[PDB]
Write a protein that binds this ligand. Structure first.
Ligand SMILES: [Mg+2]
Length: 240
């Protein structure tokens, strides 16, 4: 049994069924054509560097409900976006189904300045947590916001909705009921040189802005107590 969430995968996604892989668990949105959320579990055995990026349509989805590689033609020139990972390649590419990290269900059109800047620096610190001797797991949920019109990919006729922002909710080891946690939220237009430490939020803000309940297996009291309180995990990620 594959559990990429530990404390219950998010509720509230547009799809009632999620895709469960070793690399991640994902909840697709057939309207937006992107994942509502992607949950993953970093351990000492999951990172692998230098994997290549053969983008592919997710074979587990109906092709009408997701993007294909052709759909990104011209996107960078039109919109200054990259094919941005939701579950991060280098942190997870040691798993047995790693090629699924490059399925387009795990990709969105993410502004290059965000993808290559603060989002990447956050990914690097998130991955670095697992090197600590007393951290045995990092459990993350990531996903988009859909709050303003960001334009359309020129290379497709499909209806789709480019995200306006991206968020990441992280905890270590067992459960946020007992372990340090973090949440971050970045607009698409985040400057390239931005410090990811300046984008800390609460889990509650992300829930309000997505219609999701993250960590949905936690007791009610724990959810109510902790989700409105920003966490301290960022301090272990270099934030001061
Ligand atoms: Mg990226």
């Amino acid at each position: 049994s594959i559990d990429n969430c530990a404390v219950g995968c998010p509720t509230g996604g547009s799809s009632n069924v999620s895709i469960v892989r070793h690399a991640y668990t994902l909840n697709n949105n057939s309207t937006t054509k992107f994942a509502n959320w992607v949950a993953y579990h970093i351990t000492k055995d999951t990172p692998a560097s230098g994997k290549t990026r053969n983008w592919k349509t997710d074979p587990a989805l109906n092709p009408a409900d997701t993007l294909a590689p052709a759909d990104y033609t011209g996107a960078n020139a039109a919109l200054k976006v990259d094919r941005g990972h939701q579950a991060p390649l280098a942190s997870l590419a040691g798993v047995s189904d790693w090629e699924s990290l490059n399925y387009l269900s795990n990709i969105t059109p993410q502004k290059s300045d965000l993808n290559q800047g603060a989002w990447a620096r956050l990914e690097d610190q998130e991955r670095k947590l697992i090197d600590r001797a007393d951290i045995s797991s990092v459990y993350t949920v990531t996903g988009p916001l859909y709050e303003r019109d960001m334009g359309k990919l020129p290379g497709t006729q499909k209806a789709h909705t480019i995200p306006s922002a991206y968020w990441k909710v992280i905890f270590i080891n067992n459960s946020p009921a007992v372990n340090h946690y973090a949440a971050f939220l970045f607009d698409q237009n985040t400057p390239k040189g931005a410090d990811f430490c300046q984008f800390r939020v609460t889990v509650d803000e992300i829930e309000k802005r997505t219609g999701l309940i993250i960590w949905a297996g936690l007791p009610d009291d724990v959810q109510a107590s902790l989700k409105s309180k920003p966490g301290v995990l960022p301090e272990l990620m270099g934030c001061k």
